[PDB]
């Protein structure tokens, strides 16, 4: 019943690729927004949804200078972006490749409902992924990431929910992997809710559990992937105030219950954090007295780039200071990689 | 954990739609020959296969007259062929529904390679489909197919390969049926290899337990479904000779040891078999001496049109020759599916 | 991987003792009361609870005439009144036995605590089990019992719950059936609670379908065993008032979603009812509209010997009219059996 | 659906006592030997298989003296010796306990047939087993040990074989804990066949994999375990030569895809391996480049007394030489266990 999935070559230089992007010190940037979730983040700062638009303010972080190298390994493009130039004609994937950060596209074609639940969901992109895949690769890709969605309510991780989705998910990973393309499992765990601390720690854990069951069952090669949970936390409207202490030690603990040592690293996703918050708790999780088997970095959106967009606000000249904005949370995390953050 | 996936009506629509297809005597003409499949079977009786050589050839099957209605309840269109019209300019789809014969489509889109396993395979096509599935109720259909297939060999049927598939039928399943469209759920084990008529009884009541177990999981309304597996039968290179008794034996027990009685219907696929084996085996199942909670007739393909497609032979003259050689197959195994078929 | 459980001999004894069992009009006498529920049922009308004053009531039971032949199909023994023997030295088995009743014994061992749950459990006894059903077939038995319970509330049939327990009856079952001995599967879904009758059949549903795919996954022959599943009704704390019409319907649309055709008969479990509450609601089952593959009887324990034990009162006297209201309601649900009782 | 199995205080006992058991440069004695294997045993070296002589050479072993304990952290009690005295009329435990060693019992009742399966078994002993438990803390152990069985063959790890024993270990794991008791988990893969060392580490995978998704789903403590596996090795009868070194890469590499970081240790089982084989091949996994999140040492059986077994040979006078074979032995694993042997 073993009939070889990845061939020794293969795996190498997916592991490679894994290892390079959560080299220490490194993270991620996660500018994989939607043409449509990109439209809500122009809004608050004006800015028409143009193409342009959206192409000037990635050109804003991918313009960011060789500082950038030491805190970020990879980046996360959203598709029409991996074909964008900057205003030199200059592939924004050459960019960030020169730099020798690594390039990676966002695969997962949303999410979708899953009839006879309580507004829980799947996602969907499965269909040609693998000739995508082996186009993207073509075109500069070494990763991917692929996100579904679970919620916490009174009866939501549903044993559908949950089934499904790691299973998606498994199946995302050995298609990425059969092209050589290193997959970001991104299982989210939402915040909305008043639940405490213990009980996300407990569905991250049960989640966690089914997904790494169902890349065993799809022979997912694990070296070969990256994990990309959400923080175990209390939920958005939960009144209980917790250190950034308390909320490492439930992460790191819900995490080596779970994940195999296999995995070459977690990147943390921001969340609904603010830039602080995040930086802070991915700090404190690198400074947890728990042993860690693996690399616990960022794998950041809005944490990275909150403050930046809110600085160019569309204008040319503040460009430059948007950047700055940038490269300063992509350092400061990329400390908060190594628990050297003060 | 009991959140209503479809009401009371829409239910009842469903369970309507499916019964009128499996009504007595009735069975199911699969004309949804992909354009790629369709460039085989034209090229055997010369034919280029154009897009008009194929609406020229469904108008020999839709053509048939209203002998047809007593033992035709329901068609499987091929999209491109749902929206072609004949000659007069008449919607195929408008003549089908005319005659009161139930329209259906098949959905899936294709099938994929399962990365580790002995050439396995899963199906694709769920991405998208609730507003396809929309969009053909819209324009006619009411019911529709999805194609899993299954290998039988030392080690094929495999938990991954059983796993998903079995997972990838409930799910296509769960969103037709948000969609008033009730599915037929194919899980095709193939007929490949030298296995014996006891193995293939084994795999089939293991894989479509499986198959009902997940149609479950997602909350799969099973009387508003349809069965459309293979007849256990010997593999096309298994020496051995048995009865049509002994086939339909087998086939009704398998059948009756995994299928719940609240399924409406099994139509019976004719895979390999000959227009007179596939007319034979099933009218012996319906004699079967085994007591049957549903429906068992068929969903043919080939087993109705071979012979009709050969005397065609792609002549505008022999159209009607043709025609007769489908409607007689098309009678004589609506007999068959009531065991009434001498 | 089909190495058969059975040989072509076995399967027959199985069948047959099952079919006997479930024969029309017959039910089944459950009487396996343990010593220690057995101390509760004396209480409640004096009668000192020793194993004496036990084996006289039994007596009571068993003496009843041969009118219980055309009623009764089965009596489930409790271990110790298996040994036991009437006032004229007579095995009490050895009177069953002549009247052509079938005989059985309860052999789980009791219900024990799931760790980690809300006062769930599982069911324990498999150790040994396959000696004692040898020794158990050896003295006259020919079907077993094995009681799983299981909760509804808030959260409480819980995946493990439903999985453990649908595995130990699985193993139950296969273990009894290389002993020659039929065994009936036992998944009761207790009444408490205020959950309205739909919540119930929900449950009951995916309870069973769990049941059903462990039978298979461990091999156990369907049509050699047995389903006492509770009716599916709404909980003892329900407000809402229902028909045993609607009673009915429920219960039959979830065994007919769930339960194979194989299955040769299900045995209801009288559970909370009173006597006549399960004869209407038996009744009421076998007159509903739906279909139904398999035997729909009873093996009931209180709604068969509540007012017999009333009766009795431990008096010696009492004796004949205890057995006559026993035989009573034996034979009105032997009517009830049949949907012919007024 | 979260109702904490274990308290804190809980929680911490086991793992403490999990954690003396793996120290650094500790290992397992495993005296466990059941009265019937303890005959063959015996019969190799001339003894007649008594009571007595069993406690005569359990004595040999339990009678070494203090430089057992740096490289001895627990014993593995078979019931009866757990219960026997030397011939100062001092307890086994008692001694054992006063050197500070942990004192576990096996507590598994046996392997059994799986119905249907190619000659696979399962394992009981659940019945009852936590007032045993209970019993056994209240008589000094505070680990237990529960040996499961698979086998490799064309087709042999069944989905059942893996299913069931997973979930049984998962049972007898969860009842340990909540009586105070670290659970010694074992799926033994069995080294009989012709099998390489690449099919060893696949099945050694998947076995794994399956046994700490059942731990998750009955809410074990993982911190408050141990993993006893099999190294992966080739099997008996493959003609292939490999390196310790080898079989270190595969072992750690099998357990680093599935054990997680929070298995304080594994603890391997010296299967058919020779007395040095055993050493060395341990040696080479603490020495495997591969980064390890748990203890890596020893709970051997016949690796630590064969010499000594062997010496011995039922005289009263080579009992020291046969202590000081086990000592040997003994400290060489220790060191082993710390890939500190040369």
């Given at each position: 019943?073993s009939?070889?999935?990845?061939?020794?070559?293969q795996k190498?230089?997916?592991?490679?690729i894994a290892?390079?992007?959560?080299?220490?010190?490194?993270?991620?940037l996660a500018?994989?927004?939607?043409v449509?979730?990109?439209?809500?983040?122009?809004?608050?700062?004006?800015?028409?949804?143009?193409?342009?638009?959206?192409?000037?303010?990635?050109?804003?972080?991918?313009?960011?200078?060789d500082?950038?190298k030491?805190?970020?390994?990879?980046?996360?493009?959203?598709?029409?972006?991996?074909?964008?130039?900057?205003?030199n004609?200059?592939?924004?994937?050459?960019?960030?490749?020169?730099?020798?950060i690594?390039?990676?596209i966002?695969?997962?074609?949303?999410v979708?409902?899953?009839?006879?639940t309580?507004?829980?969901?799947?996602t969907?992109?499965?269909?040609?992924?693998?000739?995508?895949?082996?186009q993207?690769?073509?075109?500069?890709?070494?990763?991917?990431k692929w996100?579904?969605?679970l919620?916490?309510?009174?009866?939501?991780?549903s044993?559908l929910?949950?089934?499904?989705?790691?299973?998606?998910?498994?199946?995302?990973?050995?298609?990425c992997?059969?092209?050589?393309?290193?997959?970001?499992?991104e299982?989210?765990?939402?915040?909305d809710?008043?639940?405490?601390?213990?009980?996300?720690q407990?569905?991250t854990?049960?989640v966690?559990?089914?997904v790494?069951?169902?890349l065993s069952?799809?022979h997912?090669?694990?070296?070969?992937?990256?994990?990309?949970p959400?923080?175990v936390?209390?939920?958005?409207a939960?009144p209980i105030?917790?250190?950034?202490?308390?909320?490492?030690?439930?992460?790191?603990?819900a995490?080596?219950?779970?994940?195999?040592?296999?995995?070459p690293?977690?990147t943390?996703?921001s969340?609904?954090?603010?830039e602080?918050?995040?930086?802070?708790?991915?700090?404190?999780?690198?400074?947890?007295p728990?042993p860690?088997?693996?690399?616990?970095?960022?794998?950041?959106?809005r944490?990275?780039?909150?403050?930046?967009?809110?600085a160019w606000r569309?204008?040319?000249?503040?460009?430059?200071?948007?950047?700055?904005?940038?490269?300063?949370?992509?350092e400061?995390?990329?400390?908060?990689?190594?628990?050297?953050?003060?």
């Amino acid at each position: 019943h073993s009939y070889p999935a990845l061939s020794a070559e293969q795996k190498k230089e997916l592991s490679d690729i894994a290892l390079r992007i959560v080299a220490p010190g490194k993270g991620i940037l996660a500018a994989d927004e939607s043409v449509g979730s990109m439209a809500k983040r122009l809004s608050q700062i004006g800015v028409e949804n143009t193409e342009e638009n959206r192409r000037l303010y990635r050109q804003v972080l991918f313009s960011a200078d060789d500082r950038v190298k030491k805190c970020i390994g990879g980046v996360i493009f959203f598709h029409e972006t991996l074909y964008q130039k900057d205003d030199n004609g200059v592939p924004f994937v050459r960019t960030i490749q020169d730099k020798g950060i690594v390039v990676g596209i966002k695969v997962d074609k949303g999410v979708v409902p899953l009839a006879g639940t309580d507004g829980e969901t799947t996602t969907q992109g499965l269909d040609g992924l693998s000739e995508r895949c082996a186009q993207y690769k073509k075109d500069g890709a070494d990763f991917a990431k692929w996100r579904c969605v679970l919620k916490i309510s009174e009866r939501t991780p549903s044993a559908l929910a949950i089934l499904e989705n790691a299973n998606v998910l498994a199946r995302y990973a050995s298609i990425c992997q059969q092209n050589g393309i290193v997959p970001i499992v991104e299982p989210e765990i939402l915040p909305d809710g008043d639940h405490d601390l213990k009980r996300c720690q407990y569905v991250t854990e049960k989640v966690l559990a089914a997904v790494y069951k169902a890349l065993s069952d799809h022979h997912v090669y694990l070296e070969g992937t990256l994990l990309k949970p959400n923080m175990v936390t209390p939920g958005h409207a939960c009144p209980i105030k917790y250190t950034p202490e308390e909320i490492a030690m439930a992460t790191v603990t819900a995490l080596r219950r779970t994940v195999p040592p296999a995995v070459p690293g977690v990147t943390f996703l921001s969340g609904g954090q603010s830039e602080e918050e995040a930086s802070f708790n991915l700090n404190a999780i690198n400074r947890c007295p728990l042993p860690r088997p693996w690399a616990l970095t960022f794998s950041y959106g809005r944490a990275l780039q909150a403050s930046a967009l809110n600085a160019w606000r569309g204008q040319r000249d503040n460009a430059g200071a948007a950047t700055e904005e940038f490269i300063k949370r992509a350092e400061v995390n990329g400390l908060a990689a190594q628990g050297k953050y003060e």
